[PDB]
């Protein structure tokens, strides 16, 4: 609920599975997935659409439960000078299989020349890094797309949504639900004492 | 491997070092011209220094690669300025000798004080206005023989250097190591030639020169009074009347003519103490023009980053009417504005290029200039035209519903519009052609002068020579290497783009009262054409726009019916006062 | 039972009050059968006869 109406997680696109009813349906495990994007990586975050940075820098099949979650860093971190800090591969050999980690740092052999120990012509580098400034244009200011892959795996699911549960009244007859339990009757006080797990 | 792959890996490394280099040079001269400080000085001094040793350096690499072997015919069009040479192809001792031309003419352009005189402020004032014929006549004839003496060292080397370097980089003529861009040799059908602008040049000028012959009658005719024995309708004019120092300029001299002097002409400055003008002000009311045009809202950033006000003398810098296409979704406008009149037009004038500079923001680096080399300033030309039109004036709070207005507000409209920038073309054509001619060689080596008068005698009429002066390089458009068929270019593609504009707004007749607003398909159309930039021929583009893969002639005359009328009852060398 | 109506649906959190903007879609739109779409996309006609 709070991401949802939070008003502060602008770009929350979840388009397919429903924020709106995810509130109910219980998921085993989440994924925390997130990197740094600019304002023209919105667009290119758009799951099904592709581009560079879906080729070579971040990876999906075609369809994946989780949304993706992107908001202006511009303010938390710009500094006049150029935020170096930041990096980014640019053009790789081919994709890869979807979804997974890779920090492979290697050179990359552009053209005819074989790399074989050179790093000057046909053998430059795809790491590149970000210069971001206070100035910077609307479609590359940082907004950070974060993902929440959400898989079900055949085990009970864990992690659950919330439990709504109101106040209880007694001495007069009424539907209830402790847990499961849901009969129809008068609650009343008790005596008889239970034992600490029962 | 594929020359496109690594091609286009270069020119994204150089896209995205570039924003950094670049962007941040860009900046250092905007740092500079907003606060003209000395360690800027230094560090844009590295900054470019670092442009242009990737420039050297990096253009020592990319030549391994040949020229022919492009498939794509875009890769061509980032391949001539990418493939090219350069100008280190030569030796090494006429390289400080280019250096020695460009930064000695450049000083003499700076330091040439009349012993004293204050170069512009003073200059340029009393030259325009001083009227008399024995002390204007010393501040003219004193700068002939001052300036046109010392330069036959530097500009008769320069020619045949220039020439020389053409030659030995297989060019024709140092217009050839120009001209070769108007070659479309790429995607065919679409194409065009490079070796004469002869044609559609004096095509053009024997179609203006009836136009301009009528104007010239005109002219010719009204300045009787001011020397009796001096000007005659049946000769022509002299060699000091053309309203500037060379009179490169033809939209001011309504003043000196008072044909219909009964109408008031607009005045906005009444308005602008009544409603609430503040240069924060018509900005965004230009910003809501052009999305009667069709344009979206301006970026927030530029209220902050843009320089909009009157940084004064605690704010040291110089506020030149040149806009800044700083780039890296940051485009940059730093002038000293004030509310005026021409500071209204100047306004939307930088505005419109600007939104023209966001518009094709969308294209790679190498892609980020003009259509093309005169378009550049035409487009915020077009835009004051669109922008100036007063019955659209009418439409806006700067007038009142009580402003009677007749048919000759626009005939000094048009009588000023022929002495600061448009009217008599043929002077361009004097200069350029003549200019054409002498850098390209086809003169010999004493014969530049007597040129720079009977062209005139045949085409103006300003008469006074022998051989040796040499004028044409005392300019800030000629002293730092400036070709005027930009101007040429943009007084046609102006015209063009406006009927082409005002036609397709549902208004016809004459165009001098086309209002263009509330037209999403003139912006539409408008889009399809500004977001390639200069991705395709500007032949199929200028179909697209006007119609045409050549400049029109009846629309030229379809802006100027009254003024053609009005010339025709009003127009009713071999002739010496030397 | 039927329902005719074309009324703005609200698609979200922050209300439409008749416009777009953050989570707001019109519900209404159009097949405009093009040849492109797919054999699971083909139009089939349908009677139902209670």
Same mark, same amino acid.
């Given at each position: 609920?709070?991401?949802?109406?939070?008003?502060?997680?602008?770009?929350?696109?979840?388009?397919?599975? /429903?924020?709106?009813?995810?509130?109910?349906?219980?998921?085993?495990?989440?994924?925390?997935?997130?990197?740094?994007?600019?304002?023209?990586?919105?667009?290119?975050?758009?799951?099904?659409?592709?581009?560079?940075?879906?080729?070579?820098?971040?990876?999906?099949?075609?369809?994946?439960?989780?949304?993706?979650?992107?908001?202006?860093?511009?303010?938390?971190? /710009?500094?006049?000078?150029?935020?170096?800090?930041?990096?980014?591969?640019?053009?790789?050999?081919?994709?890869?299989?979807?979804?997974?980690?890779?920090?492979?740092?290697?050179?990359?052999?552009?053209? /005819?020349?074989?790399?074989?120990?050179?790093?000057?012509?046909?053998?430059?580098?795809?790491?590149?890094?970000?210069?971001?400034?206070?100035?910077?244009?609307?479609?590359?200011?940082?907004?950070?797309?974060?993902?929440?892959?959400?898989?079900?795996?055949?085990?009970?699911?864990?992690?659950?949504?919330?439990?709504? /549960?109101?106040?209880?009244?007694?001495?007069?007859?009424?539907?209830?639900?402790?847990?499961?339990?849901?009969?129809?009757?008068?609650?009343?006080?008790?005596?008889?004492?239970?034992?600490?797990?029962? | 491997?594929?020359?496109?792959?690594?091609?286009?890996?270069?020119?994204?490394?150089?896209?995205?070092?570039?924003?950094?280099?670049?962007?941040?040079?860009?900046?250092?001269?905007?740092?500079?011209?907003?606060?003209?400080?000395?360690?800027?000085?230094?560090?844009?001094?590295?900054?470019?220094?670092?442009?242009?040793?990737?420039?050297?350096?990096?253009?020592?690499?990319?030549?391994?690669?040949?020229?022919?072997?492009?498939?794509?015919?875009?890769?061509?069009?980032?391949?001539?300025?990418?493939?090219?040479?350069?100008?280190?192809?030569?030796?090494?001792?006429?390289?400080?000798?280019?250096?020695?031309?460009?930064?000695?003419?450049?000083?003499?352009?700076?330091?040439?004080?009349?012993?004293?005189?204050?170069?512009?402020?003073?200059?340029?004032?009393?030259?325009?206005?001083?009227?008399?014929?024995?002390?204007?006549?010393?501040?003219?004839?004193?700068?002939?023989?001052?300036?046109?003496?010392?330069?036959?060292?530097?500009?008769?080397?320069?020619?045949?250097?220039?020439?020389?370097?053409?030659?030995?980089?297989?060019?024709?003529?140092?217009?050839?190591?120009?001209?070769?861009?108007?070659?479309?040799?790429?995607?065919?059908?679409?194409?065009?030639?490079?070796?004469?602008?002869?044609?559609?040049?004096?095509?053009?000028?024997?179609?203006?020169?009836?136009?301009?012959?009528?104007?010239?009658?005109?002219?010719?005719?009204?300045?009787?009074?001011?020397?009796?024995?001096?000007?005659?309708?049946?000769?022509?004019?002299?060699?000091?009347?053309?309203?500037?120092?060379?009179?490169?300029?033809?939209?001011?001299?309504?003043?000196?003519?008072?044909?219909?002097?009964?109408?008031?002409?607009?005045?906005?400055?009444?308005?602008?103490?009544?409603?609430?003008?503040?240069?924060?002000?018509?900005?965004?009311?230009?910003?809501?023009?052009?999305?009667?045009?069709?344009?979206?809202?301006?970026?927030?950033?530029?209220?902050?980053?843009?320089?909009?006000?009157?940084?004064?003398?605690?704010?040291?810098?110089?506020?030149?009417?040149?806009?800044?296409?700083?780039?890296?979704?940051?485009?940059?406008?730093?002038?000293?504005?004030?509310?005026?009149?021409?500071?209204?037009?100047?306004?939307?004038?930088?505005?419109?290029?600007?939104?023209?500079?966001?518009?094709?923001?969308?294209?790679?680096?190498?892609?980020?200039?003009?259509?093309?080399?005169?378009?550049?300033?035409?487009?915020?030309?077009?835009?004051?035209?669109?922008?100036?039109?007063?019955?659209?004036?009418?439409?806006?709070?700067?007038?009142?519903?009580?402003?009677?207005?007749?048919?000759?507000?626009?005939?000094?409209?048009?009588?000023?519009?022929?002495?600061?920038?448009?009217?008599?073309?043929?002077?361009?054509?004097?200069?350029?052609?003549?200019?054409?001619?002498?850098?390209?060689?086809?003169?010999?080596?004493?014969?530049?002068?007597?040129?720079?008068?009977?062209?005139?005698?045949?085409?103006?009429?300003?008469?006074?020579?022998?051989?040796?002066?040499?004028?044409?390089?005392?300019?800030?458009?000629?002293?730092?290497?400036?070709?005027?068929?930009?101007?040429?270019?943009?007084?046609?593609?102006?015209?063009?783009?406006?009927?082409?504009?005002?036609?397709?707004?549902?208004?016809?007749?004459?165009?001098?009262?086309?209002?263009?607003?509330?037209?999403?398909?003139?912006?539409?159309?408008?889009?399809?054409?500004?977001?390639?930039?200069?991705?395709?021929?500007?032949?199929?583009?200028?179909?697209?726009?006007?119609?045409?893969?050549?400049?029109?002639?009846?629309?030229?005359?379809?802006?100027?019916?009254?003024?053609?009328?009005?010339?025709?009852?009003?127009?009713?060398?071999?002739?010496?006062?030397?």
């Amino acid at each position: 609920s709070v991401l949802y109406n939070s008003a502060s997680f602008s770009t929350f696109k979840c388009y397919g599975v /429903s924020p709106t009813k995810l509130n109910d349906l219980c998921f085993t495990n989440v994924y925390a997935d997130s990197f740094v994007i600019r304002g023209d990586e919105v667009r290119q975050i758009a799951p099904g659409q592709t581009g560079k940075i879906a080729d070579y820098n971040y990876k999906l099949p075609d369809d994946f439960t989780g949304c993706v979650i992107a908001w202006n860093s511009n303010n938390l971190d /710009s500094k006049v000078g150029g935020n170096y800090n930041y990096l980014y591969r640019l053009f790789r050999k081919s994709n890869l299989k979807p979804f997974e980690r890779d920090i492979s740092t290697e050179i990359y052999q552009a053209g /005819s020349t074989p790399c074989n120990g050179v790093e000057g012509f046909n053998c430059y580098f795809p790491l590149q890094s970000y210069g971001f400034q206070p100035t910077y244009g609307v479609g590359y200011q940082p907004y950070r797309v974060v993902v929440l892959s959400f898989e079900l795996l055949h085990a009970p699911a864990t992690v659950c949504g919330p439990k709504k /549960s109101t106040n209880l009244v007694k001495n007069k007859c009424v539907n209830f639900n402790f847990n499961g339990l849901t009969g129809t009757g008068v609650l009343t006080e008790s005596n008889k004492k239970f034992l600490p797990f029962q | 491997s594929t020359i496109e792959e690594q091609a286009k890996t270069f020119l994204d490394k150089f896209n995205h070092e570039a924003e950094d280099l670049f962007y941040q040079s860009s900046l250092a001269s905007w740092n500079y011209n907003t606060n003209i400080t000395e360690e800027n000085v230094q560090n844009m001094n590295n900054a470019g220094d670092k442009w242009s040793a990737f420039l050297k350096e990096q253009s020592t690499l990319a030549q391994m690669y040949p020229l022919q072997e492009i498939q794509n015919l875009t890769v061509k069009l980032q391949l001539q300025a990418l493939q090219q040479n350069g100008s280190s192809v030569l030796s090494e001792d006429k390289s400080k000798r280019l250096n020695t031309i460009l930064n000695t003419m450049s000083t003499i352009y700076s330091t040439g004080k009349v012993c004293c005189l204050l170069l512009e402020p003073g200059l340029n004032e009393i030259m325009a206005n001083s009227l008399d014929y024995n002390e204007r006549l010393w501040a003219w004839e004193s700068w002939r023989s001052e300036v046109g003496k010392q330069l036959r060292p530097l500009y008769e080397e320069y020619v045949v250097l220039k020439n020389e370097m053409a030659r030995a980089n297989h060019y024709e003529d140092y217009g050839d190591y120009w001209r070769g861009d108007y070659e479309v040799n790429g995607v065919d059908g679409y194409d065009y030639s490079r070796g004469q602008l002869i044609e559609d040049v004096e095509h053009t000028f024997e179609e203006i020169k009836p136009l301009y012959e009528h104007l010239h009658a005109y002219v010719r005719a009204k300045l009787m009074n001011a020397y009796p024995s001096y000007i005659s309708p049946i000769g022509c004019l002299p060699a000091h009347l053309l309203g500037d120092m060379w009179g490169r300029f033809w939209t001011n001299l309504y003043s000196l003519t008072v044909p219909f002097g009964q109408k008031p002409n607009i005045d906005v400055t009444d308005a602008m103490v009544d409603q609430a003008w503040d240069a924060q002000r018509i900005f965004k009311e230009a910003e809501k023009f052009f999305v009667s045009v069709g344009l979206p809202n301006m970026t927030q950033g530029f209220w902050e980053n843009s320089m909009l006000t009157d940084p004064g003398n605690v704010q040291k810098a110089v506020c030149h009417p040149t806009a800044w296409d700083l780039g890296k979704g940051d485009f940059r406008i730093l002038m000293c504005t004030k509310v005026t009149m021409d500071d209204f037009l100047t306004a939307h004038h930088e505005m419109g290029h600007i939104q023209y500079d966001m518009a094709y923001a969308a294209q790679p680096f190498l892609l980020r200039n003009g259509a093309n080399e005169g378009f550049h300033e035409a487009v915020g030309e077009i835009m004051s035209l669109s922008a100036a039109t007063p019955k659209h004036l009418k439409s806006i709070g700067l007038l009142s519903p009580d402003f009677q207005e007749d048919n000759e507000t626009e005939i000094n409209f048009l009588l000023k519009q022929a002495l600061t920038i448009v009217g008599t073309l043929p002077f361009t054509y004097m200069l350029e052609k003549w200019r054409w001619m002498v850098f390209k060689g086809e003169i010999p080596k004493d014969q530049w002068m007597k040129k720079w008068w009977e062209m005139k005698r045949e085409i103006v009429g300003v008469v006074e020579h022998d051989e040796t002066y040499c004028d044409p390089a005392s300019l800030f458009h000629v002293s730092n290497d400036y070709s005027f068929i930009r101007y040429y270019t943009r007084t046609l593609y102006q015209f063009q783009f406006q009927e082409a504009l005002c036609q397709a707004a549902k208004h016809e007749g004459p165009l001098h009262k086309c209002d263009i607003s509330n037209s999403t398909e003139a912006g539409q159309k408008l889009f399809n054409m500004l977001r390639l930039g200069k991705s395709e021929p500007w032949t199929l583009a200028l179909e697209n726009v006007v119609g045409a893969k050549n400049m029109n002639v009846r629309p030229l005359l379809n802006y100027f019916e009254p003024l053609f009328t009005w010339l025709k009852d009003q127009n009713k060398t071999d002739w010496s006062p030397y």
